């Protein structure tokens, strides 16, 4: 009807995660659909996963496009500010057990959000990057593993 869309780029918006299921996306999201005017917002999954995009339509009558634009690039900025990640492969032989523990170990850390280490110790977390720095995250697992 009268609804418009604008779509932009993720990594413009979010640089530097992983994939496009990093919870970033959706903080990006569910803060998006928080906003007056926005009708829907949504992820455009791409094949190439960094070709990926947020589609958000908005009703022109409530705001206008600069406006919805602004809001959207500028939630993002905030949002990649914020948040940090590292994905690194540790040193080490892991096992659905051994890789649990040092799980629970990155997790309760001062800064850690979320964290998934896997078989062969590939570790996924994400921080807060006001409380914590990637380098404190290496040192904290240099006990045991390291980069």
Do not use: M
């Not at 634009?69 to 900025?77: D, F, I, K, N, Q």
């Amino acid at each position: 009807n009268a609804t418009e869309k604008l779509r932009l780029d993720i990594p413009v918006l979010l640089p530097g995660l992983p994939d496009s299921s990093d919870p970033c996306v959706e903080r990006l999201l569910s803060e998006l659909r928080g906003k007056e005017g926005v009708e829907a917002a949504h992820i455009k999954t791409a094949n190439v996963d960094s070709d990926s995009q947020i589609c958000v339509h908005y009703d022109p009558a409530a705001i206008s496009l600069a406006r919805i634009r602004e809001l959207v690039t500028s939630t993002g900025a905030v949002i990649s500010s914020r948040f940090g990640h590292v994905l690194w492969q540790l040193k080490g032989v892991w096992h659905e057990r051994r890789a649990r523990t040092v799980a629970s170990q990155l997790r309760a850390l001062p800064g850690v959000i979320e964290a998934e280490v896997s078989a062969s110790g590939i570790a996924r977390v994400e921080f807060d990057n006001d409380r914590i720095s990637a380098a404190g995250i290496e040192q904290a697992l240099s006990k045991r593993g390291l980069a």
